Amino acid sequence: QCQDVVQDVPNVDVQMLELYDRMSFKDIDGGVWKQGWNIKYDPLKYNAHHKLKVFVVPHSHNDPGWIQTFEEYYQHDTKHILSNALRHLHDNPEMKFIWAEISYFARFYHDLGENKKLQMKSIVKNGQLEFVTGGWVMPDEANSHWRNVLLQLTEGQTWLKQFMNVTPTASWAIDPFGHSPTMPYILQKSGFKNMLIQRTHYSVKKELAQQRQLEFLWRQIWDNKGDTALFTHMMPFYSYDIPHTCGPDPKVCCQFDFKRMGSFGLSCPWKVPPRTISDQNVAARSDLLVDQWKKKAELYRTNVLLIPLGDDFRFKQNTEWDVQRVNYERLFEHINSQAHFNVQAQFGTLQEYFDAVHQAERAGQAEFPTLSGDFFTYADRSDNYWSGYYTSRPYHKRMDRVLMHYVRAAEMLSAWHSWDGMARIEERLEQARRELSLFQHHDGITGTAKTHVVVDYEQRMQEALKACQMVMQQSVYRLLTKPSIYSPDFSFSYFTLDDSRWPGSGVEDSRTTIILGEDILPSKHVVMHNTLPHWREQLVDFYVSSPFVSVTDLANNPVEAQVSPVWSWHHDTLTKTIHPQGSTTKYRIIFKARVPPMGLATYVLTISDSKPEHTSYASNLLLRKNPTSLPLGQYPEDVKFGDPREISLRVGNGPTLAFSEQGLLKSIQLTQDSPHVPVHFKFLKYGVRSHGDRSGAYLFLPNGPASPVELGQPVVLVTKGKLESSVSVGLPSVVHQTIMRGGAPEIRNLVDIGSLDNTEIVMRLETHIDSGDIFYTDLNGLQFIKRRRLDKLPLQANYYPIPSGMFIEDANTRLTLLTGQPLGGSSLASGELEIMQDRRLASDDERGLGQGVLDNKPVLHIYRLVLEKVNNCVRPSKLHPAGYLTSAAHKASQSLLDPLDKFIFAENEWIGAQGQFGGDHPSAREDLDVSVMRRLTKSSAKTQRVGYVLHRTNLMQCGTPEEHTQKLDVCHLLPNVARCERTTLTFLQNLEHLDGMVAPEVCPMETAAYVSSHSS
Ligand SMILES: Cc1ccc(C(=O)C[C@H]2CC[C@@H](O)[C@@H]3[C@H](O)[C@H](O)CN23)cc1
Ligand SMILES: *[C@@H]1O[C@H](CO)[C@@H](O)[C@H](O)[C@H]1NC(C)=O
């Protein structure tokens, strides 16, 4: 049935980890092809019976924000490009053009009059204008979560099906900075047949070109059978621009970019301009161009050649359309009529190229190699590795993950009902999906846009978060109010969200205090949502105006609670210390919420005059020389003080953690009897080189290994409670916090790099674990891939994306660090993990951004730290390129990415309140998630349709008996099911009509989509 993703090592022609181990990475001058060699070809290879078929594919790379905002580029460039494309393609039936970014196309098309809409539909229908990929954007592939890659693909493709009646099956990704196998994974499950990539390490291009392995069947690293395979074309040269797409010599190719003759303010840096094609020069020009084509053709296996023709924001001016088209038409007429060339050249689209390639394949003309692995970390030249952008603008990287979850929760909570148009549910959800989708752009989440553009993305995401809150809170009120009492004002706020970790303590004072008092309001209802499809317990906290508060469920059962102070950290510019102040006007109440699968649970907070029976109070200990009193308004326990010292803590039956006198972890003891395993946190700093290339938004070019941050004598705060304990320390640039709730600790860093120019702050873990040169990092929150540290490569080359987690292990022990935000990281020595927190860079790194990174702001990074014994786990063999999380580590990741949502009832009394929603929902096996639940129809549809994306991960078998859980059949989650279909992941095509309207669960590492149809 299901493929074994652990025990069978796939046999592939190219495995990128193995390739990396063998390659030398020498950066030698290859001649005109600076990073290759002088290509030779046999002129007699092509003849009358075997011609070279050449497809010249016009394109225009349009960034949805970079140096300008989306709207600035739309007004100044893109609207003119699309307008002139429509005119010129309409008027010139053999001209072709491909388009990738649907965010721009939708913006344009909706502003068109009906006549022009019809013209546009016609040039798409007839194949002149072809959409490639069809996502809202061309996303980053390093930092993006797979769920958001799917979100943005679906946004663009849903628009294309509705308005243009097409669904692309070829993908075009010419600009992301390195490439991820998460893309073919999603694309192949979304009906795609082909994909194209460009930005891969120059040494990889050379190696694959030499073996004619630039076209390959890209399968997942664990895929033994090959069912995930997607045909992939890797472009061979340094850029997608015209000088680097006609052939190996940019000095020649530049002469065939007809926009470079002077009137457009562009020129050829190789000092030879293009010249207008005429009858007197066409033979000579053709000879030069065809020679380039035949050289490029040597790197591939068929007699069909792809020649992209484009660059950034090209095909704007009418004069540009003419100058490219007329000159190429003259070259085609000459070349195609001269038999001695044995070439047939034409304008084409991307699908046309792929179709012809596979025709050649089926004719037995070529067979293609299989490949697995990824294409990180990218270098475009010399030692310029693009690992900086794994961390750049970390505030917005963390915001990405927050909004990811709010979109999921808003779509899910509102999916349970059909909503009247007046509720504006669909409107708000579309806005939220679109702003988050926009941010997936390869200058959005990457932190590689100009300062004002970053601000635009932030403002858009803030509006998206507000839209999610509105939808979520309307949905909670409807789900938990007696139906005959339910009386909505769709503009009113029945609940406000409370979020403990975004923007976070010390980032924004954004949270509302629950105000109670005998003379004002004795009690308050709160509600938790659990977006995951299994019963879940999690500690939750709220701010309250009194420490004397107790918690009940809606059956009035007491719930054990803990009250702690509200601590905030301050750089005391008077004492020159970083130390905590306690609130005298508000307090934190903490309790364990238990919430049904995909459901809601209601609790009540009630004030009393004195300590309630079921509420305890944390002790607080401030460790510093030279202490002063710390009064806490009404809080019942006095703060204690002491000189700095080592401390040890244990919550519940959980691990025992020991800390240095500087408030940093030193060891973890898993059980009563077990060893105190050395696990040490350390903060260090990287600098920038004083001569040669400087680090910037893209590039990480350290001036050597990191140096320890000088800690001085930092102030340490220890809070000890029955339910939650913590150690917090004010370090230079970081308030570092270790929180213990009875399992793996949570780590929070409040990172404020301040005015520390040319500094990158790293958090490192030092252990004994005999990992050697092996570590594991994830790809897009989807899969874990084996990394091998290579000392033959510079430090920055050994940095990889940490989009959600990383681990090291030996035969017996593993340490896993899970993240709530994508950052860059590595293991630079056996037993180490490290992850960059922020970076402030004074210089530009010469990739067109034209600024450093000097717009840092405070950010709250979050993590879980999981130390485990793994000697009993069934792990992949030493040759397997994948790794897998344990149950504890997977749950720890879910706690960061999809926590419980918290809602505080806004008015004094909630008439008709109910205690629970979803008590009858199936509690699915722990490795299964309902990644997406989305109602697909508006209220006026006779047949309602609801879409589900189901993802099953793969967890290691380590000897824990599995408990019987319930089968999850998403098609029966809503009543009156009439049909259940398996669909592509975008929901746009039906793949299978399902027996008995039952949606089967998926295999480990598989993702499936289902749509249920409901007659009532
Ligand atoms: C002198 C110079 C050299 C290289 C470049 C790029 O690669 C720019 C590429 C890659 C980075 C990315 O931020 C940008 C935008 O997305 C543009 O589309 C071009 N991209 C630019 C200038
Ligand atoms: C859309 O394209 C399909 C498939 O080519 C065609 O049959 C149909 O007439 C077009 N219009 C629709 C489905 O409205």
Ligand SMILES: [Zn+2]
């Ligand atoms: Zn770009």
